[PDB]
Design a protein around this ligand. Sequence first.
Ligand SMILES: Nc1ncnc2c1ncn2[C@@H]1O[C@H](COP(=O)(O)OP(=O)(O)OC[C@H]2O[C@H](O)[C@H](O)[C@@H]2O)[C@@H](O)[C@H]1O
Length: 186
Amino acid sequence: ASMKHNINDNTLEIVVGDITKETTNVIVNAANGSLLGGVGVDGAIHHAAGPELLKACQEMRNNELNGEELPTGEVIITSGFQLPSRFIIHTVGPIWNQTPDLQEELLANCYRNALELVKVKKLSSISFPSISTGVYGYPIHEAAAIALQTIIQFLQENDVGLVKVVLFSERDYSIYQEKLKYLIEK
Ligand SMILES: Nc1ncnc2c1ncn2[C@@H]1O[C@H](COP(=O)(O)OP(=O)(O)OC[C@H]2O[C@H](O)[C@H](O)[C@@H]2O)[C@@H](O)[C@H]1O
Protein backbone atom coordinates (compact mmCIF):
# COMPACT_ATOMS: atom_id res chain seq x y z
CA ALA A 1 0.00 0.00 0.00
CA SER A 2 1.31 3.42 -1.10
CA MET A 3 -0.01 6.95 -1.90
CA LYS A 4 2.00 9.71 -3.67
CA HIS A 5 1.47 13.47 -4.08
CA ASN A 6 3.50 16.28 -5.69
CA ILE A 7 3.91 19.54 -3.70
CA ASN A 8 5.64 22.07 -5.95
CA ASP A 9 8.81 20.19 -7.07
CA ASN A 10 8.71 17.91 -3.95
CA THR A 11 7.02 14.52 -3.54
CA LEU A 12 5.25 13.17 -0.43
CA GLU A 13 4.58 9.44 -0.24
CA ILE A 14 2.92 7.36 2.48
CA VAL A 15 3.78 3.65 2.37
CA VAL A 16 3.54 0.44 4.42
CA GLY A 17 7.04 -0.82 5.00
CA ASP A 18 10.12 -1.45 7.09
CA ILE A 19 12.09 1.80 7.43
CA THR A 20 15.33 -0.20 7.77
CA LYS A 21 14.88 -1.38 4.19
CA GLU A 22 14.28 1.98 2.58
CA THR A 23 15.74 3.51 -0.54
CA THR A 24 15.78 7.08 0.77
CA ASN A 25 19.15 8.72 1.49
CA VAL A 26 18.06 9.54 5.02
CA ILE A 27 15.80 7.84 7.52
CA VAL A 28 14.58 9.31 10.79
CA ASN A 29 14.98 7.48 14.08
CA ALA A 30 12.42 8.07 16.82
CA ALA A 31 15.14 8.02 19.49
CA ASN A 32 15.43 8.68 23.19
CA GLY A 33 17.23 11.70 24.65
CA SER A 34 20.15 9.63 25.89
CA LEU A 35 20.75 8.27 22.40
CA LEU A 36 20.80 4.73 23.82
CA GLY A 37 19.25 1.63 22.26
CA GLY A 38 15.57 0.89 22.79
CA VAL A 39 12.69 -1.15 21.39
CA GLY A 40 10.31 -0.40 18.51
CA VAL A 41 11.66 1.50 15.48
CA ASP A 42 14.80 2.60 17.37
CA GLY A 43 15.53 -1.05 18.20
CA ALA A 44 15.00 -2.12 14.58
CA ILE A 45 17.28 0.65 13.36
CA HIS A 46 20.06 -0.26 15.77
CA HIS A 47 19.74 -3.95 14.84
CA ALA A 48 19.88 -3.26 11.11
CA ALA A 49 22.61 -0.59 11.29
CA GLY A 50 24.88 -2.67 13.50
CA PRO A 51 26.87 -1.79 16.64
CA GLU A 52 28.69 1.19 15.19
CA LEU A 53 25.49 3.23 15.38
CA LEU A 54 25.27 3.21 19.21
CA LYS A 55 28.98 4.07 19.39
CA ALA A 56 28.58 7.01 17.01
CA CYS A 57 25.52 8.31 18.89
CA GLN A 58 27.40 8.17 22.17
CA GLU A 59 30.26 10.11 20.58
CA MET A 60 27.67 12.73 19.53
CA ARG A 61 26.27 12.83 23.08
CA ASN A 62 29.71 13.37 24.56
CA ASN A 63 31.19 15.69 21.91
CA GLU A 64 28.26 17.77 20.46
CA LEU A 65 25.69 17.53 23.31
CA ASN A 66 28.24 18.13 26.11
CA GLY A 67 27.27 14.82 27.77
CA GLU A 68 23.55 15.64 27.98
CA GLU A 69 20.30 14.49 26.44
CA LEU A 70 19.11 15.51 22.94
CA PRO A 71 16.11 17.73 23.74
CA THR A 72 12.58 16.90 22.59
CA GLY A 73 12.02 18.03 18.98
CA GLU A 74 15.70 18.50 18.19
CA VAL A 75 17.85 16.51 15.74
CA ILE A 76 21.30 15.10 15.12
CA ILE A 77 22.65 13.17 12.11
CA THR A 78 24.85 10.07 11.95
CA SER A 79 25.81 7.56 9.33
CA GLY A 80 23.39 4.73 8.58
CA PHE A 81 26.26 2.25 8.73
CA GLN A 82 24.90 -1.16 7.64
CA LEU A 83 21.49 0.26 6.63
CA PRO A 84 20.83 0.79 2.93
CA SER A 85 20.10 4.46 3.71
CA ARG A 86 23.27 6.56 4.04
CA PHE A 87 22.24 8.68 7.04
CA ILE A 88 20.02 8.59 10.10
CA ILE A 89 18.57 11.78 11.55
CA HIS A 90 17.81 11.02 15.22
CA THR A 91 15.10 13.01 16.91
CA VAL A 92 13.23 12.73 20.22
CA GLY A 93 9.45 12.95 20.08
CA PRO A 94 7.31 14.11 23.03
CA ILE A 95 6.10 11.58 25.58
CA TRP A 96 2.34 11.82 25.30
CA ASN A 97 0.59 13.99 27.88
CA GLN A 98 3.69 14.78 29.93
CA THR A 99 3.48 18.38 28.63
CA PRO A 100 0.12 18.59 26.92
CA ASP A 101 0.28 22.32 26.08
CA LEU A 102 3.66 22.03 24.33
CA GLN A 103 3.52 18.56 22.78
CA GLU A 104 1.95 19.48 19.42
CA GLU A 105 4.63 22.15 18.93
CA LEU A 106 7.44 19.78 19.98
CA LEU A 107 6.27 16.95 17.73
CA ALA A 108 6.07 19.39 14.83
CA ASN A 109 9.61 20.48 15.58
CA CYS A 110 10.88 16.91 14.99
CA TYR A 111 9.56 17.10 11.42
CA ARG A 112 10.50 20.67 10.70
CA ASN A 113 14.03 20.35 12.07
CA ALA A 114 14.67 17.09 10.17
CA LEU A 115 13.38 18.62 6.93
CA GLU A 116 15.42 21.79 7.48
CA LEU A 117 18.58 19.68 7.84
CA VAL A 118 17.74 17.76 4.61
CA LYS A 119 17.13 21.12 2.84
CA VAL A 120 20.33 22.84 3.95
CA LYS A 121 22.55 19.79 3.48
CA LYS A 122 20.91 18.92 0.10
CA LEU A 123 20.27 15.33 1.21
CA SER A 124 17.45 14.82 -1.37
CA SER A 125 15.28 12.08 0.16
CA ILE A 126 14.10 11.15 3.62
CA SER A 127 11.77 8.69 5.32
CA PHE A 128 9.98 9.27 8.61
CA PRO A 129 8.44 6.63 10.91
CA SER A 130 5.42 7.47 13.08
CA ILE A 131 7.27 9.47 15.75
CA SER A 132 6.02 9.17 19.40
CA THR A 133 3.26 6.61 18.66
CA GLY A 134 5.03 3.56 20.14
CA VAL A 135 6.49 3.57 23.67
CA TYR A 136 5.85 7.31 23.87
CA GLY A 137 2.08 6.71 23.65
CA TYR A 138 0.94 9.48 21.31
CA PRO A 139 -2.47 8.70 19.71
CA ILE A 140 -1.91 7.93 16.01
CA HIS A 141 -4.86 10.03 14.79
CA GLU A 142 -3.50 13.21 16.42
CA ALA A 143 0.17 12.47 15.64
CA ALA A 144 -0.56 11.75 11.99
CA ALA A 145 -2.38 15.06 11.63
CA ILE A 146 0.58 17.01 13.10
CA ALA A 147 3.13 15.07 11.01
CA LEU A 148 1.29 15.61 7.73
CA GLN A 149 0.41 19.25 8.39
CA THR A 150 4.00 20.02 9.28
CA ILE A 151 5.47 18.13 6.33
CA ILE A 152 3.00 19.57 3.83
CA GLN A 153 3.52 23.17 4.99
CA PHE A 154 7.30 22.73 4.82
CA LEU A 155 7.12 21.26 1.29
CA GLN A 156 4.89 24.15 0.14
CA GLU A 157 7.58 26.68 1.16
CA ASN A 158 10.88 24.82 0.55
CA ASP A 159 12.76 22.71 -1.98
CA VAL A 160 13.56 19.41 -0.21
CA GLY A 161 13.01 16.48 -2.63
CA LEU A 162 11.29 13.17 -1.76
CA VAL A 163 9.65 12.66 1.65
CA LYS A 164 8.21 9.30 2.66
CA VAL A 165 6.26 8.34 5.76
CA VAL A 166 6.91 4.64 6.31
CA LEU A 167 4.30 2.90 8.46
CA PHE A 168 4.85 -0.46 9.98
CA SER A 169 1.11 -1.36 9.92
CA GLU A 170 -1.84 -1.22 7.50
CA ARG A 171 -3.84 0.42 10.35
CA ASP A 172 -1.34 3.26 10.82
CA TYR A 173 -1.20 3.58 7.02
CA SER A 174 -5.02 3.72 6.67
CA ILE A 175 -5.11 6.53 9.27
CA TYR A 176 -2.44 8.50 7.37
CA GLN A 177 -4.26 7.88 4.09
CA GLU A 178 -7.50 9.40 5.43
CA LYS A 179 -5.73 12.48 6.88
CA LEU A 180 -3.65 13.08 3.73
CA LYS A 181 -6.74 12.90 1.49
CA TYR A 182 -8.37 15.53 3.75
CA LEU A 183 -5.35 17.87 3.69
CA ILE A 184 -4.90 17.40 -0.09
CA GLU A 185 -8.59 18.27 -0.66
CA LYS A 186 -8.48 21.14 1.87
N1 LIG B 1 10.96 -1.09 11.13
C1 LIG B 1 10.04 -0.08 11.16
N2 LIG B 1 9.75 0.70 10.06
C2 LIG B 1 8.85 1.71 10.12
N3 LIG B 1 8.15 2.02 11.23
C3 LIG B 1 8.32 1.27 12.39
C4 LIG B 1 9.29 0.16 12.41
N4 LIG B 1 9.27 -0.40 13.64
C5 LIG B 1 8.36 0.28 14.37
N5 LIG B 1 7.79 1.27 13.62
C6 LIG B 1 6.75 2.24 14.02
O1 LIG B 1 7.38 3.44 14.47
C7 LIG B 1 6.44 4.17 15.29
C8 LIG B 1 7.14 4.72 16.54
O2 LIG B 1 7.08 3.81 17.63
P1 LIG B 1 8.32 3.75 18.64
O3 LIG B 1 9.19 2.92 17.75
O4 LIG B 1 8.01 2.85 19.90
O5 LIG B 1 8.87 5.34 18.93
P2 LIG B 1 8.55 6.38 20.10
O6 LIG B 1 8.93 7.78 19.70
O7 LIG B 1 7.15 6.19 20.50
O8 LIG B 1 9.40 5.94 21.36
C9 LIG B 1 10.76 6.26 21.34
C10 LIG B 1 11.11 5.37 22.48
O9 LIG B 1 10.97 4.04 22.03
C11 LIG B 1 12.28 3.57 21.70
O10 LIG B 1 12.71 2.60 22.68
C12 LIG B 1 13.18 4.81 21.79
O11 LIG B 1 14.44 4.30 22.14
C13 LIG B 1 12.50 5.56 22.90
O12 LIG B 1 12.53 4.89 24.15
C14 LIG B 1 5.26 3.22 15.50
O13 LIG B 1 4.23 3.52 14.56
C15 LIG B 1 5.86 1.86 15.20
O14 LIG B 1 4.91 0.81 14.92
